[PDB]
């Protein structure tokens, strides 16, 4: 591995509520300051990473509803004006698009009949927002035309609350997972989906008719024996986790089966490896990757930060020196790498933020 990091700073947010999400803005241009967002309680807080471990508070957003509990945030930009944007959501089930420059709410989306666990923006189209809910469904929105493009759920949709989802690298497909122990593939490069996406860009005030996607392109309940709270693509492979204190690397179908040739009926699944760690068997503990997918990071319920080198084939030999600090004891809900992998931020259940600079 050889990846080393030093803890250069930490701070605590005065609300003292758990911090459930952290995301670096990967849209900032090279040389611009490194900025990340933290979410917890009814707060969205922006910070700037400066020299000598300085974490400079930029602005704070306070949701008028004191009972709102943000679980996730995601960065985008306005395709017309090149202006940065931030989506936030949680407990209330409302998507809020905040202007990060003014820290004011631009617009919101109501629709999910329950809480939102994850928000992800399409890797190519910055207007395609994917929300994942406790309502058993995933929703795809066009935030430029304010249309609900598709609702992924129904007859062969998730049976329980959806916990996480991720787009592949080029955004041709989505892999979702939840409480129902399943992992479902949803192709968005299908002619039906591409057309729905085209139709949402054409919509201008009869309201827009969202596609109801009742059927996935693959479904498996044979990777994990309990909830699947985190999923991300690793090339054509999948990285997913449950309570088994391991992140599992797998692929739909048999060993030689190409991801784009698998049938929705595909019965088989090939487990390829495992990333073992400890004291992370509780729910809502997300893992992250850096932009180049060279590094893998997960925090545990006791303040430890596991980091793996993905360019090392053996998932045992891949483990890098686990990151610890004697004052970091709370649960690490989520981590975020800066776009250039030089900074790694971890947020905790005690409202603390930790900064790990690469050596």
């Amino acid at each position: 591995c050889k990846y080393s990091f030093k803890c250069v700073n930490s701070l605590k947010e005065d609300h003292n509520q758990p911090l459930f999400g952290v995301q670096f803005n990967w849209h900032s241009k090279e040389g611009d300051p490194l900025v990340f967002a933290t979410v917890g309680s009814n707060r969205v807080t922006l910070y700037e990473c400066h020299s000598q471990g300085e974490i400079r508070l930029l602005q704070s957003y306070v949701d008028a509803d004191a009972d709102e509990n943000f679980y996730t945030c995601a960065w985008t930009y306005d395709s017309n004006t090149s202006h940065p944007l931030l989506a936030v959501a949680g407990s209330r089930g409302i998507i809020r698009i905040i202007n990060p420059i003014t820290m004011q709410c631009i617009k919101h989306y109501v629709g999910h009949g329950n809480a939102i666990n994850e928000l992800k923006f399409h890797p190519r189209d910055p207007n395609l927002l994917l929300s994942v809910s406790k309502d058993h469904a995933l929703r795809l929105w066009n935030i430029q035309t304010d249309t609900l493009v598709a609702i992924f759920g129904g007859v062969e949709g998730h049976r329980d609350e959806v916990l996480s989802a991720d787009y592949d690298l080029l955004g041709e497909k989505i892999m979702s997972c939840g409480m129902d122990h399943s992992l479902k593939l949803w192709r968005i490069n299908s002619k039906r989906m591409m057309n729905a996406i085209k139709e949402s860009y054409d919509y201008n005030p009869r309201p827009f008719i969202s596609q109801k996607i009742h059927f996935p392109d693959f479904s498996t309940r044979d990777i994990h024996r309990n909830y699947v709270d985190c999923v991300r693509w690793l090339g054509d492979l999948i990285l997913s986790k449950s309570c088994e204190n391991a992140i599992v690397c797998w692929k739909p179908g048999k060993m030689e089966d190409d991801i784009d040739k698998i049938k929705p009926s595909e019965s088989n699944v090939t487990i390829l490896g495992r990333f073992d760690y400890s004291q992370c068997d509780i729910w809502y503990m997300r893992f992250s990757m850096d932009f180049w997918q060279k590094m893998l990071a997960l925090g545990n319920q006791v303040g430890k930060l596991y980091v793996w080198d993905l360019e090392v084939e053996d998932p045992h030999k891949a483990k890098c020196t686990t990151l610890t600090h004697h004052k970091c004891g709370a649960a690490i809900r989520q981590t975020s790498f800066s776009r250039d992998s030089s900074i790694l931020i971890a947020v905790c259940d005690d409202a603390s933020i930790w900064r790990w600079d690469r050596l």
Binding site: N25, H27, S82, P123, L170, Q293
Partner: peptide
């Protein structure tokens, strides 16, 4: 190998996104 080829797919595809990001000039926060 399964790894070698999966890593090249990641390389090629993250490069596509990196080239698209290089073209952009997103306004600083």
């Amino acid at each position: 190998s399964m790894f070698s080829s999966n890593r090249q797919k990641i390389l090629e595809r993250t490069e596509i996104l990196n080239q698209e990001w290089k073209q952009r000039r997103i306004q600083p926060v």
